Write a protein that binds this ligand. Structure first.
Ligand SMILES: CCCCCCCCCCCCCCCCCC(=O)OC[C@H](CO[C@@H]1O[C@H](CO[C@H]2O[C@H](CO)[C@H](O)[C@H](O)[C@H]2O)[C@H](O)[C@H](O)[C@H]1O)OC(=O)CCCCCCCCCCCCCCCCC
Ligand code: CLA
Ligand code: CLA
Ligand code: CLA
Ligand code: CLA
Ligand SMILES: CC(C)=CCC/C(C)=C/CC/C(C)=C/CC/C(C)=C/CC/C(C)=C/CC/C(C)=C/CC/C(C)=C/CC/C(C)=C/CC/C(C)=C/CC1=CC(=O)C(C)=C(C)C1=O
Ligand SMILES: CCCCCCCCCCCCCCCCCC(=O)OC[C@H](CO[C@@H]1O[C@H](CO)[C@H](O)[C@H](O)[C@H]1O)OC(=O)CCCCCCCCCCCCCCCCC
Ligand SMILES: CCCCCCCCCCCCCCCC(=O)OC[C@H](CO[C@@H]1O[C@H](CS(=O)(=O)O)[C@@H](O)[C@H](O)[C@H]1O)OC(=O)CCCCCCCCCCCCCCC
Ligand SMILES: CCCCCCCCCCCCCCCC(=O)OC[C@H](COP(=O)(O)OC[C@@H](O)CO)OC(=O)CCCCCCCCCCCCCCC
Ligand code: HEC
Ligand SMILES: CCCCCCCS[C@@H]1O[C@H](CO)[C@@H](O)[C@H](O)[C@H]1O
Ligand SMILES: CCCCCCCS[C@@H]1O[C@H](CO)[C@@H](O)[C@H](O)[C@H]1O
Ligand code: OEX
Ligand SMILES: [Ca+2]
Ligand SMILES: [Ca+2]
Ligand SMILES: [Cl-]
Ligand SMILES: [Cl-]
Ligand SMILES: [Cl-]
Lengths: 334, 97, 30, 34, 97, 243, 151, 201, 49, 137
């Protein structure tokens, strides 16, 4: 075998402790670059003029932040969607002032994570598995793309992408609510049903299986020793779990088929999160949450407030305060 | 793929109970503190620095300005029993908006 | 000292990842 | 920055005390007769 | 001791009338006939040593002078305050509705 | 003749026009005629900041810095009256144009110095008896340097001069005195000085070009700290016309 | 029109209130719209010179039709709610408007995304079926059982 | 008026003004109270008495607004100055003190009057020692607060303890798992008339 | 229950409605800075996890 | 509270004459105002120039007076600046400039009266909200 064949065999080998593969060939360097840049920046990067108004925001630990307040800060509004690699800057000091690290990190990360998805497909193929775990991973991946790439594209600037930090994430959410009324958007609502529902069904399934574990141990040992890795028989009694849950609600509201049950466990959070992502991705082009401001009016024409109008007052507070030095004209149009 | 994996089915399903159940319990504890206004509202070190240094800015201080907007703009209608009258000139607002 | 503490905890976490992956108890089919 | 002066030892003992508890239990399990 | 010059200026006639040397232009909308033609002429030819000097702006029609005469009781003049007149702020001071 | 699409993204838009090496002629001034500068352009090439010594009796020098705000630094499209004085000197009175740029430069070790690079309200004069503008002509004058931030600017805790809180609201019961300087915003207005050295003259077109040096104070953050002294050096271009 | 010198007007941040430079020096509009300086449209180009927006043309050459068009476009920005209330999220009901650009963009992002999902689904499945394990693992021939342990 | 009584009428002693990670005694916040400054009476240039709107416990910060005895707004501290109508400067607001350390005194300079109005949103006004403890000026809760918090939290956790041990008690027989010989008939619908009861086939 | 019992009255409990609940969330952000709270953060990790 | 004939009674001219609009006239006025005007004047403000609103007091201080049906109808025919000094048909919708503001092409005299009636009646209903902007939402 020639060197190229040998190389291919190693790359695609099923015997490596961590699978490499062709997607991995792109994934490994890209993720390494984003990770190393992120760590260095989070610790040591100087303040970044996020909104392009010569008002630098400090994100790093050494420059006055803790874990909660710290972030890698989005690139400058003056840059917009322009590509800003290191080599476009006159110097590293310039690169840092303008938020170059943010772009390096999000681009390497989105590429690497896309490749992580591909790699899940690939290993599934090498092992003779069915292929759709990667489809499940498309839901969180799409969500990352929405907040790091699609929202910036729609708004015209990477300065409006989600910051790489805890408090910065909260900032992104609050401004998003001011600008799009996301809580009143049905795709975010489906998202919430997706994650609340996912947590519910996680707990529910965990609890039902745990409840029907077949006795294999004594009281003085963990019941977990009753399962042995790779044993052929199922470790809990699905018939009993179904008898239970079926009587909790009614018979036909409970799954008796383990396959349908597990498909449901996959599909409910995945679909809901797909809609969460599509929410952000469509509010990116300013198709916003439902607007019922002054929808209810009395016989004379007096406005009768509903809870929607209280939401509106909250959103106004957010709107009038955000980026307090960046607007010169009355309408915030992106 | 990920470096680690479940090998015990019983532990796997127990963990599925543990994670969301414990999360919800933790949130409940925080809300009990909020019943008393015992908030995690501020970082004192942040506030001392920002008070002294008008060039010091983080996402933390940026979010507090948003909170202040919410309070002033929502309170009069959300808390009608207080009979708040906040004249236009006292409302917090950035440039133009 | 705060920065040192944060970065130390983070570093310990990464080390833990390393041991958890490469020095795990190997799964064995009985 | 004017941090709380007890924060360092609070964090240190928060990490050390339970970590050590776990290490003790693990090592004495390993040394039990196979 | 340190003083906010704007708050301070509010305690002078600037806080009571349209200050021909300082007030932002939108204020001329308060009274009939002043905006935008006369308002522009007045801001352009500022500052003025006394109110009546506004009648000396070159090019004024007789009607315009009469309108000004009718409105002198609503005008004042104080010292030019740099903080109010820099930034083209007399033409747009960042306030809309 | 270049178009916007020829220029866009190249960096050329931040450069002043040049005259070639042949342009060493003389532009005749008619004392019976009125003149204008139809376009004055200033392109800074070096920003130096005076170091701030500890002993306050050592000779402080101007040191080099790194520009971090990119090709956004030049003054241009400036016009104004060019008066012929009794003694034959000429005085440029600046009227309008893009006559300021905020600029941030970075000192060794990382300290950032924002300034409002400017020639606002410039009044600059030549020597007496200038019957022609030549490569021996120079202009010297002064200008105004207003606060780098204007009156609406809010600090990160929402405090300001013409708007904003007037106190440190996150510390409701702190003593006010030690915070006064941060709490009470002030608006700076100082003078700067500039020299223009003519190096080239096209007496046919009325165009001139040369080098400039200006000196002014940097940002003082609305009274929160002392400004630094700054020296700016670069090249200039001007078109002179009878008006 | 009110008399402002828009070239020299310094905004609150130090940047021009109306006009500023792009990172390569071009004269562009200020405020948040600094992000949009790559914009080109027939109502705006006549004010454009070699170095970007031209102050002389701005001072002398703006026509009524340009004012009209800019007013029209400013007040028909592609922002609006799902129930077609025009304007920002906090705007009151009155104007029935969501830009066709928004309808088209949003619909086609949704469709493109689900079509990527469909590509993954059918590509993975086609691979599995061509290889012969799209229905699951052969219990008597489980490939992982013939592989050496990872550790 | 006893100083102790006036001291109860101050929001710095309200237990609903603290923070979860603002640790220590109340004195570490506003300081060690030394003396009542006295009761502040605000008046405008027309001599009308004005009343500072008090801070409700909900608000970490609150604007400064003064009304007449009928709640009509008469003065304030504006945010935007450009269209201000109610500034202390425009309205000639003064403050005079009755009782306490400042008794008999009147102040007319806007900065001072404003400082006292800001304090007046907290109720009665006190002089504090902030140096002894290096107090940071941020409100902390009292032992009423801390006690309440700890006990509501612990009670709630002990609910879980109750559930857990009640479960272990009533289900002791199956806590290592369910009968390996569990017959499907016991969980199949309609087989037994009464659920889980073999004598009801 | 516990939350409004600690506050002035039942008025500040959540109202039973979709938009009403959204309002509850926004009230908690503005007045409590609830996203900053490590107990909420653990809640979020448990739900998303 | 009701939309009574009194609420619907507004000044016809500056000489003390009133006109009482019908409920249908009021509805037509709201419809036509949304159709031709709300894109800039939603809620009684002016998006392309917030210094000038549609409050009745503001209209009364305009030159010539615009706080009555005649004034408003004339404005819709031949709009001027606030001081009456320049005609602005070239940049503001009117019948005179129906050629460049095509939405004005179908507006009849009846329609203009309805729009004027809307502008005058709304603040009687909404008070400070009318012309108030986001502060009063
Ligand atoms: C809740 C129950 C749900 C139960 C489960 C069922 C699953 C599907 C549910 C769909 C709900 C059906 C509602 C039908 C009513 C409706 O829609 O009513 C709306 C209209 C009919 O109502 C008319 O709707 C109009 C909408 O405004 C439009 O027309 C206006 C006036 O001309 C303006 O021009 C405006 O700019 C323009 O947008 C006006 O408001 C009219 O007054 C009104 O009469 O139906 C239409 O449009 C037809 C719809 C066309 C298909 C939409 C394709 C584009 C979608 C983009 C997708 C991107 C992501 C979306 C995120 C969500
Ligand atoms: C897997 C390897 C890998 C990949 C894919 C990337 C990708 C990237 N790097 Mg990174 N980088 C890497 C490893 C990698 N990096 C390593 C090891 C280092 C340390 C030396 C770096 C150090 C680094 C720095 C310092 C920077 C980058 C930057 C970038 C971005 C711009 C790169 C560019 O302009 O090239 C363009 C190259 C080409 C166009 C050549 C392609 C030639 C083929 C024939 C054309 C095919 C293209 C077409 C789409 C086909 C794709 C195939 C597909 C259809 C299947 C891009 C996201 C920049 C950035 O982040 O800016 C914000 C940046 O500043 N990289
Ligand atoms: C990343 C996004 C995110 C996520 C995942 C969460 C997650 C959570 N939030 Mg947080 N939140 C967020 C962002 C997020 N939040 C932001 C940005 C804010 C602004 C500060 C908030 C503000 C906020 C508030 C104010 C509250 C939460 C709470 C919670 C917890 C609610 C748990 C629950 O399911 O209660 C659901 C309700 C129950 C579990 C009660 C029992 C329900 C019974 C079983 C229902 C039975 C219905 C019945 C069958 C009939 C149905 C009839 C039908 C017609 C409807 C959960 C940890 C809550 C919390 O922390 O509580 C302790 C809470 O009060 N959040
Ligand atoms: C390219 C697709 C597309 C786009 C961009 C538009 C855009 C528009 N339509 Mg048209 N139309 C379309 C397709 C489209 N339509 C189709 C398929 C029909 C036949 C039903 C129509 C029939 C129609 C009528 C009768 C009318 C319109 C109207 C309109 C306008 C208002 C829309 C509105 O208010 O929606 C409201 C918003 C919704 C209904 C939300 C839809 C949400 C969907 C259900 C989400 C689905 C997600 C995804 C597809 C599902 C994947 C599932 C996943 C698990 C895999 C707007 C310009 C109106 C108009 O103004 O005409 C002048 C109008 O009266 N359309
Ligand atoms: C019922 C319990 C209780 C209460 C209500 C009080 C109340 C008080 N103490 Mg006392 N104290 C107690 C028990 C208590 N103490 C105990 C057991 C000790 C020995 C350690 C002390 C030793 C002590 C000292 C030395 C001092 C006080 C002081 C005080 C006062 C200030 C309190 C403060 O700042 O707390 C701050 C409270 C917090 C920051 C809350 C901590 C929340 C924890 C960290 C959450 C843990 C989360 C957990 C890890 C999550 C697990 C997740 C997992 C299950 C998945 C206050 C009156 C101070 C004082 O003023 O003295 C005059 C003072 O100096 N106390
Ligand atoms: C004082 C007086 C009058 C007393 C009267 C008492 C008396 C005699 C009453 C008799 C008369 C009577 C009954 C009156 C009733 C009145 C009445 C209608 C009350 C109704 C009140 C009410 C609101 C009830 C609501 C109940 C309710 C909402 C139930 C939820 C239904 C629902 C959404 C179910 C979803 C189920 C579902 C699809 C689950 C899938 C996901 C899931 C759980 C996966 C996990 C899983 C499932 C399995 O399946 C198995 C196997 C395993 C392994 C497993 O992982
Ligand atoms: C055996 C070894 C034990 C090792 C323990 C190691 C400590 C780990 C960290 C503990 C947390 C410390 C946080 C406060 C940091 C600090 O500096 O505090 C310091 C504070 C004291 O506060 C100090 O006081 C000083 C004057 O005495 C000064 O004012 C200081 O400025 C001030 O910080 O310590 C305490 O108050 C401890 C008592 C706290 C009681 C809280 C009761 C409510 C708790 C309920 C929680 C239940 C949650 C269950 C959820 C599941
Ligand atoms: C009113 C207008 C007109 C109608 C308009 C129609 C609009 C489109 C409707 C689309 C309907 C889709 C049908 C799905 C069929 C299917 O999945 O079969 C696959 C299996 C087959 O069931 C299994 O079926 C098996 C037999 S067989 O496989 O079908 O042959 C059987 O063995 C097993 O026991 C049984 O459980 O279905 C299940 O496993 C049960 C779960 C079904 C739902 C899962 C998908 C949706 C999840 C929720 C979506 C997210 C929403 C919330 C987001 C937060
Ligand atoms: C492409 C390469 C990608 C590699 C990326 C690195 C992955 C790191 C994964 C975690 C390793 C540590 C696991 C320790 C713990 C460990 O070794 O677990 C090992 C354990 C094995 O379970 P078993 O079923 O084999 O255990 C059965 C019995 O032994 C139990 O008694 O795995 C799990 O329990 C899965 C659930 C926990 C999964 C935890 C996920 C953690 C994610 C990280 C969260 C914190 C990040 C903070 C960042 C600052
Ligand atoms: C934006 C594109 C507009 C549309 C559409 C309409 N109006 Fe307007 N209006 C607009 C501006 C910019 C101005 C100010 C003009 C100036 O320089 O003075 C106005 C002003 C008015 C006024 C006068 C307001 C006052 O005197 O206080 C009126 C009465 C008025 N507009 C009415 C009006 C009507 C009835 C419209 C629909 C038919 C309409 N306007 C459309 C901007 C715009
Ligand atoms: C291993 C790389 C460590 C991270 C590099 C940090 C940038 S280097 C750093 O920059 C600071 C600001 O200019 C200087 O004050 C400081 O002296 C210098 O060491
Ligand atoms: C110094 C300004 C003149 C008016 C006095 C301020 C109001 S009262 C002032 O408030 C402080 C809390 O901020 C206390 O620490 C201090 O003891 C008290 O004198
Ligand atoms: O950047 Mn970030 O946030 Ca999206 O709106 Mn516009 O721009 Mn800014 O304001 Mn609102
Ligand atoms: Ca020379
Ligand atoms: Ca101190
Ligand atoms: Cl913000
Ligand atoms: Cl803007
Ligand atoms: Cl007004």
């Amino acid at each position: 075998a020639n060197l190229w064949e040998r190389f291919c065999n190693w790359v695609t080998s099923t015997d490596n402790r961590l699978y490499v593969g062709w997607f991995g060939v792109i994934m490994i360097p890209t993720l390494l670059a984003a990770t190393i840049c992120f760590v260095i920046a989070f610790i040591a990067a100087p303040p970044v003029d996020i909104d392009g108004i010569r008002e630098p925001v400090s994100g790093s630990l050494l420059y006055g932040n803790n874990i909660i307040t710290g972030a890698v800060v989005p690139s400058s509004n003056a840059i917009g969607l322009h590509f800003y690699p290191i080599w476009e800057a006159a110097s590293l000091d310039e690169w840092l002032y303008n938020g170059g690290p943010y772009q390096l990190i999000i681009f390497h990360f989105l590429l690497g994570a896309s490749c992580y998805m591909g790699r899940q497909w690939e290993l599934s193929y090498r092992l003779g598995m069915r292929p759709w775990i990667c489809v499940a991973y498309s839901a969180p991946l799409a969500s990352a793309f929405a907040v790091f790439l699609i929202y910036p594209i729609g708004q015209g600037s990477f300065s409006d992408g989600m910051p790489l930090g805890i408090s910065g994430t909260f900032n992104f959410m609050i401004v998003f609510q001011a600008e799009h009324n996301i809580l009143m958007h049905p795709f975010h609502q489906l998202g919430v049903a997706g994650v609340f529902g996912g947590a519910l069904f996680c707990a529910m399934h965990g609890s039902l299986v745990t409840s029907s574990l077949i006795r294999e141990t004594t009281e003085t040992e963990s019941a977990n020793y009753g399962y042995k890795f790779g044993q052929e028989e199922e470790t809990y009694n699905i018939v009993a779990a179904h008898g239970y849950f079926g009587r909790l609600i009614f018979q036909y509201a409970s799954f008796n088929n383990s396959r349908s049950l597990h498909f449901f466990l996959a599909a409910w959070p995945v679909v809901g999160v797909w809609f969460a992502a599509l929410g952000i991705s469509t509010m990116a082009f300013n198709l916003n949450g439902f607007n019922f401001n002054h929808s209810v009016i009395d016989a004379k024409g007096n406005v009768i407030n509903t809870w929607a109008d209280i939401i509106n007052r909250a959103n106004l507070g957010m709107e009038v305060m955000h980026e307090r030095n960046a607007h010169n004209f009355p309408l915030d149009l992106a | 793929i990920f470096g680690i994996a479940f090998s015990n089915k019983r532990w796997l399903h127990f963990f599925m109970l543990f994670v969301p159940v414990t999360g919800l319990w933790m949130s409940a504890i925080g809300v009990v503190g909020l019943a008393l206004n015992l908030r995690s509202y501020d970082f004192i070190s942040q506030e001392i620095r920002a008070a002294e240094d008008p060039e010091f800015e983080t996402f933390y201080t940026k979010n507090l300005l948003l909170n202040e907007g919410i309070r002033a703009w929502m309170a009069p209608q959300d808390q009608p029993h207080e009979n708040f009258v906040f004249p236009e000139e006292v409302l917090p607002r950035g440039n133009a908006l | 000292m705060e920065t040192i503490t944060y970065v130390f905890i983070f570093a310990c976490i990464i080390a833990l990842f390393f041991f958890a992956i490469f020095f795990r108890e190997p799964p064995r089919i009985t | 920055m004017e941090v709380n002066q007890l924060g360092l030892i609070a964090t240190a003992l928060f990490v050390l005390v339970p970590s050590v508890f776990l290490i003790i239990l693990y090592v004495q399990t390993e040394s039990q007769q196979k | 001791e340190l003083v906010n010059v704007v708050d301070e200026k509010l305690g002078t006639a600037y806080g009571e009338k349209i200050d021909l040397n300082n007030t932002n232009i939108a204020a001329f909308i308060q009274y009939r006939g002043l905006y935008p033609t006369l308002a522009k002429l007045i801001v352009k030819n500022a500052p003025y040593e006394s109110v009546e000097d506004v009648l000396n702006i070159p090019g004024l029609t007789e009607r315009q002078k009469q309108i000004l005469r009718e409105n002198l009781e609503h005008f004042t003049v104080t010292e030019v305050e740099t903080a109010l007149v820099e930034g083209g702020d007399r033409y747009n001071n960042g306030l809309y509705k | 003749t270049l178009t916007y699409d020829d220029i866009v993204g190249t960096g050329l838009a931040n450069k002043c026009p040049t005259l070639d090496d042949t342009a060493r002629g003389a532009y005749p001034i008619d004392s019976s005629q009125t003149y204008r500068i139809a376009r004055l352009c200033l392109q800074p090439t070096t920003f130096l900041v005076k170091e701030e010594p500890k002993n306050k009796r050592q000779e402080a020098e101007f040191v080099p810095t790194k520009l971090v705000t990119r090709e956004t630094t030049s003054l241009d499209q400036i016009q104004g009256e060019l008066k012929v004085n009794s003694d034959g000197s000429l005085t440029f009175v600046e009227e309008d144009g893009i006559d300021f740029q905020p600029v941030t430069v970075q000192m060794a070790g990382g300290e950032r110095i924002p300034l409002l690079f400017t020639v606002k309200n410039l009044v600059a004069s030549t020597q007496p008896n200038v019957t022609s503008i030549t490569t021996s002509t120079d202009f010297k004058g002064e200008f105004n340097v207003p606060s780098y931030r204007t009156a609406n600017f809010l600090d990160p805790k929402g405090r300001g001069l013409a708007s904003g809180y007037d106190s440190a609201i996150a510390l409701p019961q702190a003593k006010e005195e030690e915070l006064a300087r941060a709490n009470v915003k002030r608006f700076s207005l100082t003078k700067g000085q500039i020299s223009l050295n003519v190096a080239k003259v096209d007496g046919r077109t009325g165009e001139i070009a040369g080098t400039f040096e200006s000196e002014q104070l940097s940002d003082d953050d609305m009274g929160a700290h002392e400004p630094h002294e700054v020296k700016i050096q670069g090249v200039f271009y001007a078109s002179i016309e009878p008006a | 029109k009110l008399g402002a010198n828009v070239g020299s007007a310094q905004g609150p941040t130090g940047l021009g209130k109306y006009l500023m430079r792009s990172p390569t020096g071009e004269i562009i509009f200020g405020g948040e719209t600094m992000r949009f300086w790559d914009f080109r449209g027939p109502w705006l180009e006549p004010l454009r010179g070699p170095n970007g927006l031209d102050l002389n043309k701005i001072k002398n050459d703006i026509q009524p039709w340009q004012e009209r068009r800019a007013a029209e476009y400013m007040t028909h920005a592609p922002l609006g709610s799902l129930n077609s209330v025009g304007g920002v999220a906090t705007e009151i009901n009155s104007v029935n408007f969501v830009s066709p650009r928004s309808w088209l963009a949003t619909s086609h992002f949704v469709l493109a995304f689900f079509f990527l999902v469909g590509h993954l689904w059918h590509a993975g499945r086609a691979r599995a079926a061509a290889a012969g394990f799209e229905k699951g693992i052969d219990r008597e021939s489980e490939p992982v059982l013939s592989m050496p342990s990872l550790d | 008026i006893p100083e102790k009584l006036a001291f109860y009428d101050y929001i710095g002693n309200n237990p609903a003004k603290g923070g979860l990670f603002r640790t220590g005694p109340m004195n570490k916040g506003d300081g060690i109270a030394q003396a009542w400054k006295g009761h502040a009476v605000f008046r405008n240039k027309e001599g009308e008495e004005l009343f500072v709107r008090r801070m409700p416990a909900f608000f970490e910060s609150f604007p400064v607004i003064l009304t007449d005895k009928n709640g009509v707004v008469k003065a304030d501290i504006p945010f935007r100055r450009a269209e201000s109508k109610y500034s202390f400067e425009q309205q000639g607001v003064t403050v005079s003190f009755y009782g306490g350390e400042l008794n008999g005194q009147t102040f007319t300079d806007p900065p001072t009057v404003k400082s006292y109005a800001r304090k007046a949103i907290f109720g009665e006004i006190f002089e504090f020692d902030t140096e002894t403890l290096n107090s940071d000026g941020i409100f902390r809760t009292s032992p009423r607060g801390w006690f309440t918090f700890a006990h509501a939290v612990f009670a709630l956790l002990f609910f879980f303890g109750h559930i857990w041990h009640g479960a272990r008690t009533l289900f002791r027989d199956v806590f290592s798992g369910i009968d390996p010989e569990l017959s499907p008939e016991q969980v199949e619908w309609g087989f037994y008339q009464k659920v889980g009861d073999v004598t009801t086939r | 229950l516990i939350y409004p019992l600690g506050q002035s009255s039942w008025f500040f409990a959540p109202s039973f409605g979709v938009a009403a609940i959204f309002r509850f969330l926004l009230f908690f952000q503005g007045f409590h800075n609830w996203t900053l709270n490590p107990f909420h953060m653990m809640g979020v990790a448990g739900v998303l996890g | 509270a009701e939309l009574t004939p009194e609420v619907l009674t507004v000044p016809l001219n500056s000489e003390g004459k009133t006109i009482t609009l019908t409920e249908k006239q009021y509805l037509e006025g709201k419809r036509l105002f949304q159709y031709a005007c709300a894109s800039c004047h939603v809620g009684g403000i002016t998006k392309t120039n917030p210094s000038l609103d549609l409050r009745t007091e503001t209209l009364a201080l305009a030159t010539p007076p615009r706080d009555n049906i005649e004034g408003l109808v004339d404005y819709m025919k031949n709009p001027t600046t606030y001081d009456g000094e320049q005609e602005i048909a070239e940049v503001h919708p009117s019948l005179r400039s129906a050629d460049i503001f095509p939405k004005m092409r179908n507006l009849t005299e009846k329609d203009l009266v309805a729009i004027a009636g809307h502008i005058l009646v709304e603040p009687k209903i909404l008070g400070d909200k009318w012309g108030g902007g986001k502060v009063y939402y």
